[PDB]
Design a binder for this molecule. Structure first.
Ligand code: W8F
Ligand code: W8F
Lengths: 237, 300
């Protein structure tokens, strides 16, 4: 069934689950050709597969070569996503396989369900939550590994850095979605907010800066002000 | 021509015989139906006047025996039975015929409707779908469920139609997920036609029988089966040319015969719009599309 605001704590219970976002799988630049027609050039993409309890992110990089000579690429991308998620589940020991997979766009439901017929006990679900996982490519270290890749490749991250040492997964998810929402609404400002203090660095083995508890509250406030600021610029309120 | 004689008509009832129907009043001197065309399967069906709940009836072929109908006052319905004494049966039929106590199967000579609805419907095909093999005729009613409906509850009183399920391992070859989901030709041609049904005659058989049971009994699971079987063909990129042509003919006469006033509960808007306008065979069913558009344009 659909995941929404009524059953939101289910994300953080002890049943293994993954979110799958396919927004950034098939990415193109659109340009004019010499003859003045339009054509696309594809660039590297990625599947964003995330355990919201642990922060474990399975970043499957989608190299442009996987589109070569294929037709109807927007449709193929949903099936390529479903094929790679199925491949991931099969590669995991049984006790690590998810009990549920939540897709962020409903168009992923059939492709994934078809690829996972072999796993009838894994529930494939949509969600009414609008999650900002498309902004994942505003995270510099993630964007860099996607663009540098010369072959298909899976890279594993913890998108919560070390936060779970200090906060619950519910709070770490809330932080993450507010950070991603901010980067999605105004990327420049969000990054400005995150780095304006050169004395807070990003550890080589982390994605986000090493903010103290107190500094995270400030940062969170500034991000909410930004999302409100942009809402105001947008709708003229 | 053959006869289905009746012991009596003790309760008021609407009687169906193939695509015809007539009213019999409580204790009216009715003793059955004569001049039934030999050569086709037939169905005789019932709706009680005091309880339109439970339409029910019997599929039969007069070439396979001498059958008759008697009301059963314990079970409360008109039952088909077989008289094995041929002498007794001819004699019983001749006296009612002489007293003119029987209605005549009213086949107009120009009229191929029944043939066109049953072209692929023989009793050997029907026997694969229902389970009750002590009789040479087969009982169906409004509320019988299908084997697939039981999966989703008595198996003795079920319709054994073949389970069609587009998101099932049978429908989808490992490694051809996208291909086999978006183009059902493997499922239609290799799994169903070459593997479960054997030829397109047993396959159009079940199709036609499913429609007839939906229409005559309002059997909801038969209606699902008819739509599923259509959609599998229309959703297959590769279908033999002769099946598409015959399918167009099958459907044309089903649509032509459907009561206008039952169209809302017998026709699935999604399947038909998909089949006629989006599917691989959107341009391959000229006769059916033309009749659907002129008869049920609301649904489209
Ligand atoms: C209605 O016809 C019959 C009736 C009985 C017994 N009522 C036996 C056999 C036949 C043919
Ligand atoms: C109509 O013919 C068949 C029907 C079934 C059961 N739906 C099985 C096998 C065959 C040949």
């Amino acid at each position: 069934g659909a995941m929404n605001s009524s059953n939101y704590a289910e994300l953080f219970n002890n049943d293994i689950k993954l979110f799958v976002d396919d927004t950034n799988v098939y990415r193109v630049t659109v340009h004019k050709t010499f003859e003045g027609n339009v054509a696309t050039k594809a660039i590297n993409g990625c599947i964003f597969t995330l355990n919201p309890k642990t922060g474990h992110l399975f970043l499957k990089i989608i190299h442009t070569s996987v589109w070569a000579g294929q037709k109807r690429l927007s449709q193929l991308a949903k099936w390529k996503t479903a094929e790679e998620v199925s491949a991931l589940v099969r590669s995991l020991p049984k006790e690590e396989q998810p009990k549920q997979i939540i897709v962020t766009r409903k168009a992923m439901l059939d492709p994934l369900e078809v690829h996972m017929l072999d796993f009838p006990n894994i529930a494939i679900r949509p969600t009414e939550l609008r999650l900002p996982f498309s902004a994942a490519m505003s995270i510099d270290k993630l964007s860099d590994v996607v663009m540098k890749a010369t072959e298909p490749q899976m890279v594993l991250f913890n998108i919560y850095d070390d936060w779970l040492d200090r906060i619950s997964s519910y709070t770490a998810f809330s932080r993450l979605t507010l950070l991603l929402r901010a980067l999605k609404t105004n990327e420049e400002s969000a990054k400005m907010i995150l780095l304006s203090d050169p004395t807070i660095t990003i550890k080589s083995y982390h994605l986000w800066p090493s903010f103290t508890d107190e500094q995270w509250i400030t940062i969170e406030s500034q991000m909410r002000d930004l999302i409100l600021t942009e809402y105001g610029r947008k709708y003229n309120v | 021509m053959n006869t289905v004689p009746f012991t009596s008509a003790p309760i008021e009832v609407t009687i169906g015989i193939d695509q015809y129907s007539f009213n019999v009043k409580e204790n009216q001197p009715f003793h059955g139906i004569k001049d039934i065309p030999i050569g086709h399967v037939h169905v005789i069906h019932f709706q009680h006047a005091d309880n339109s709940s439970m339409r029910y009836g019997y599929w039969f072929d007069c070439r396979m025996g001498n059958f008759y109908i008697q009301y059963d006052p314990k079970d409360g319905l008109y039952k088909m039975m077989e008289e094995r004494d041929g002498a007794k049966f001819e004699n019983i039929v001749h006296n009612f015929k002489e007293r003119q106590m029987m209605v005549s199967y009213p086949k107009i000579d120009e009229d191929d409707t029944w043939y066109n609805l049953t072209e692929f419907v023989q009793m050997d095909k029907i026997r694969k779908i229902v389970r009750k093999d002590e009789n040479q005729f087969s009982y169906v009613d409004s509320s019988m469920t299908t084997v697939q409906e039981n999966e989703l509850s008595d198996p003795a009183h079920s319709l054994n139609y073949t389970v069609i399920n587009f998101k099932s391992r049978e429908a989808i070859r490992p490694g051809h997920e996208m291909e086999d989901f978006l183009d059902k030709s493997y499922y239609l041609n290799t799994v169903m036609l070459q593997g479960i049904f054997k030829n397109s005659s047993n396959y159009f058989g079940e199709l036609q029988f499913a429609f007839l049971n939906a229409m005559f009994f309002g059997n909801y699971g038969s209606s699902l089966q008819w739509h599923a079987m259509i959609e599998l063909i229309c959703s297959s990129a590769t279908v033999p040319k002769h099946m598409l042509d015959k399918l167009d003919e099958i459907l044309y006469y089903q649509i032509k015969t459907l009561p206008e006033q039952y169209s809302d509960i017998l026709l699935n808007e999604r399947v038909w719009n998909i089949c006629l306008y989006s599917s691989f065979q959107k341009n391959s069913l000229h006769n059916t599309e033309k009749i659907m558009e002129n008869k049920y344009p609301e649904l489209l």
